[PDB]
């Protein structure tokens, strides 16, 4: 339900694309209705805790996650199935906040791999694929576990 799930997905994607030298403002389609990116207060605190959690894991495991994105298909059609079956496996040990750190970090790296392959138009679709999964499976577990506001109090 909550549109904030997409707003915090856009931020860590757009930052990873900016570190590769790319521009989200050129890839973005059309603005929807209301509310902006996480630059305020409590949503900016989620973003900050989540960014350090991704950045430390990317230092220690750059090789592992780059080899994991190399086998995953990212083109429309088969990718929507190829992503689902792999994400349903990485949460199979538990739906915990530690596996949510891996889920977002993998999705952000897949978006980069698409732009780097000259498939920049998919930045909108790959972001929707992970945000739709996050609404379909994680959102009720996230709210039962105190929301992203609890994640920043645990990991910030």
């Amino acid at each position: 339900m909550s549109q904030s799930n997409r707003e915090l997905v856009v931020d860590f994607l757009s930052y990873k694309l900016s570190q590769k030298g790319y521009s989200w403002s050129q890839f973005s389609d059309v603005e929807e209705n209301r509310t902006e990116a996480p630059e305020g207060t409590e949503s900016e605190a989620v973003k900050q805790a989540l960014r350090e959690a991704g950045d430390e894991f990317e230092l220690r495991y750059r090789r592992a996650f780059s080899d994991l994105t190399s086998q995953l298909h990212i083109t429309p059609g088969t990718a929507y199935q190829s992503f689902e079956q792999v994400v349903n496996e990485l949460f199979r040990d538990g739906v915990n906040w530690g596996r949510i750190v891996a889920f977002f970090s993998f999705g952000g790296a897949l978006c980069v791999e698409s732009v780097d392959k000259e498939m920049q138009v998919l930045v909108s679709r790959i972001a929707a694929w992970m945000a739709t999964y996050l609404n379909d499976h994680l959102e009720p577990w996230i709210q039962e576990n105190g929301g992203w506001d609890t994640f920043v109090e645990l990991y910030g």
Binding site: A49, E52, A53, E56, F57, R60, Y61, A64, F65, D67, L68, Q71, E89, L90, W97, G98, R99, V101, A102, L154, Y155
Partner: peptide, 25 residues
């Protein structure tokens, strides 16, 4: 583990399991 046509287990049973040394974040 050996390879299967449905899942690259020889590679993925490494990368997913290799992360054991950090409980994320």
């Amino acid at each position: 583990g050996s390879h299967m046509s449905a899942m690259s287990t020889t590679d993925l049973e490494a990368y997913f399991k290799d992360c054991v040394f950090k409980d994320w974040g």
